[PDB]
Design a binder for these strands. Sequence first.
RNA 1: CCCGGCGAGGGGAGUGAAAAAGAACCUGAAACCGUGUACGUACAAGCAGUGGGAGCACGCUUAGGCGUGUGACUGCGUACC
RNA 2: UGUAACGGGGCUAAACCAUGCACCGAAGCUGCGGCAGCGACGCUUAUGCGUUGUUGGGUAGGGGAGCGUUCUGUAAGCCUGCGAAGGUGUGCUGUGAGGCAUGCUGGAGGUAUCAGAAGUGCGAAUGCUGACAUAAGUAACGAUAAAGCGGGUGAAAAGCCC
Lengths: 103, 142, 150, 117, 55, 110
Amino acid sequence: MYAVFQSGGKQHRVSEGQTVRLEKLDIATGETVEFAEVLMIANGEEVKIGVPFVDGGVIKAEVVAHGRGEKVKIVKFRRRKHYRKQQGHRQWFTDVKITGISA
Amino acid sequence: MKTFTAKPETVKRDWYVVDATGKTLGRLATELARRLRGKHKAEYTPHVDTGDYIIVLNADKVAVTGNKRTDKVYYHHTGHIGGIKQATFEEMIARRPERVIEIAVKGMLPKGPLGRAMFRKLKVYAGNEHNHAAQQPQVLDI
Amino acid sequence: VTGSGKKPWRQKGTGRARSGSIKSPIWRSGGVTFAARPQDHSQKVNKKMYRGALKSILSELVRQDRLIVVEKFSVEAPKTKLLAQKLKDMALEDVLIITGELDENLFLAARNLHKVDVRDATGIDPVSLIAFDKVVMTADAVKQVEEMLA
Amino acid sequence: ARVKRGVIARARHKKILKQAKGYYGARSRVYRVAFQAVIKAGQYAYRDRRQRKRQFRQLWIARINAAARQNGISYSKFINGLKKASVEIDRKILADIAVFDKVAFTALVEKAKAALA
Amino acid sequence: AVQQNKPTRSKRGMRRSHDALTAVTSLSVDKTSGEKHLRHHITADGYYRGRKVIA
Amino acid sequence: METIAKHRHARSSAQKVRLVADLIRGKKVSQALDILTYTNKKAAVLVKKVLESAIANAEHNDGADIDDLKVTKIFVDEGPSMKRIMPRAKGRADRILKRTSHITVVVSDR
RNA sequence: CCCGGCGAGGGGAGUGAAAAAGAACCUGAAACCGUGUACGUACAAGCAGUGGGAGCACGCUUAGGCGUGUGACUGCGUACC
RNA sequence: UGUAACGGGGCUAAACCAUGCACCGAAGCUGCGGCAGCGACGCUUAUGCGUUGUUGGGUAGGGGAGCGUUCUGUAAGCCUGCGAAGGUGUGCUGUGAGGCAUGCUGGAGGUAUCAGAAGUGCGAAUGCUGACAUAAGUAACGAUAAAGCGGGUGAAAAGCCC
């Protein structure tokens, strides 16, 4: 019972009841999203892959968290040329809790 | 998620026996190195030795095409005054048959401690018999 | 800086860096590169800029209810307790009394009070008008600061 | 107004020496060597964010090639048959499926071979 | 003569690994008195193998 | 109680003192005492005086029990160094350091 | 008071708010030198990092695993001015 | 100096010629997320908000916007012996210089906000001053006139006294 779907520009493999950190959605923290573009649903050995986004199956997930990632420290340096540059980054994410894979 | 990595304690390695009679040197050596590194298994990991143990019987009967039986020279240097030693394929096959197979496979392996371990997987014999009958070596034909 | 102008070692021949004197600001106990002189920090204000600034301060002071105008402000003895009780009854904490004429009596009875200052009309400065919480002034002082400024 | 620069300089040096924690020898102790170490570590971290994205793809490609060659087909004909069979499963997911559940991978090789041949 | 750069504290400790002073294994006991001494030496009280030698 | 004893500004370098301090770490204190007796060093007589001072402090200041003592923590720190001047050849001056050390012995029943 | 050379130095007791305020005395950093504990390391070659990553050891826990430290092996990588 | 004129193994194709189909392959392009500059087009111009497009490698150099340190006013204010500055850890947080909190040490100072003034920010100058390393427990211990024993003194004697 695992499904493969494309959320935020990239694919994800997902079981029922695991928390998944994907890109930032414009969804509030107490609601549920339904990804309708499910690439592959496999239960037992009856694997249903599709000419894309197979049919019917919907992945409902409830949003839990909206944090930011670990601070990445970007350093540009050109040696003996009198140039360095310092920058920081933190990436927004969204944590979803999967609660069902349809047929 | 994170991608799968193999773990060195739970990797389960097989034994194979290859009869190297009447085969080309480098084709057999390439198949041997591919099986030794582990690139035929789905759970391949570039820093974990995934490969299998291979017992290569009959290193005497390996073949080389063209005039390579008399003119493939092996060079090695003793690290001394000016002694560069050299030996062709014929006197290397006669004097030390397993060194041909081990040199051909060791040139095809990664260099580093992992490559030395995956070379220790390889066990080359020149006879038709081996003493490794307690590990059940399956026939791997190529 | 005190010291002689002799080279401490040669120019060439030693392993040491080139040096010319012990008084150079690189060295310890001998010093400052750009040393200060006593300098004049007075900057010129225009007369009209000063008068317009005082008019702006008085306008915002009467706009902000910080300007009290008193008919007549009199204290008999030079006692500071009398002025303290007088400013207590008028509910005043931090006062600038600009009286119309600096009598020596009321000036002597505010020298010990901290948040209370007594000036003449000519002694009006901008920063004391902004400093004290309540400027109070006698009516003749209002007339004098009007005819002096405008 | 004489400014003494002991506190600000000690803070600026402690900031750098906290980042060189774990380096061999004077690279974790001495400020000059630790500054050069921290700067080259930042350069390597930039370059290796790029090379991380490359190296994981070549790892997935080697695993897909291996598990496809256990199913008769090479990597090239498998990816061509999956493109002509119009799937959007990328190489991260194909490699994860190729290791974890081989049944789906046999179904995928069956579909790609039906499209290819 | 001189070094091109200074050795580490690691290469200094590896060099001084061979400088450990050996201990005496055990002192031997005299038969009469019971005082410890080195082997083949007299005691501090001048006994050797149960015989008073020096006065 | 752990019962320290020190000798501060011991007139020897800490390397030479640390040589014989390596010999008696963790030993039972009678073995430590006669090993320190039969060693041909002056660091031996220095740390032997510190060790017997430690046993005496353990006897007198707290409970009892000479024979149960074990030399748990012996360490040599580097003390101040006194700077002198050695005249070398051709007029150039030198600087020798008379090194000192702090010897500390911690001996306890545990 | 005790060890020690009727030493230096130390440990108690005592003073004091405080003696890691004891005269070598407010604070007490860095370089440097040590002692202990965890992990690694004696067939493996190079700016000593960085990306991946097993195992081990401490903490926890929603009992799935996270965090901290170390880091075998492995891709790339010839300091700064 | 050592094969040494495929990078190597090795190859009779794993070489060359032609034709084609796949695939790998960059920080290119696309996808998703975010930040900033410039210019158009509107809302009523807290000179902002939005929609669209485009730009965003950089030395010498030009332009713009900031952080922090010491001192002055606000400030006889506010915080502070139920603990300040400084030191030392940890956790948060910002695009960055940074900032906030709090544990231990410390034992009396510090300073908002907005303005103002600079002895205002160091890794390099065979920089200067102090401390500490390395070589390294290494060379050396200063005429190759030379010492040996007994007794004493002492905690201790090759060197002192006899």
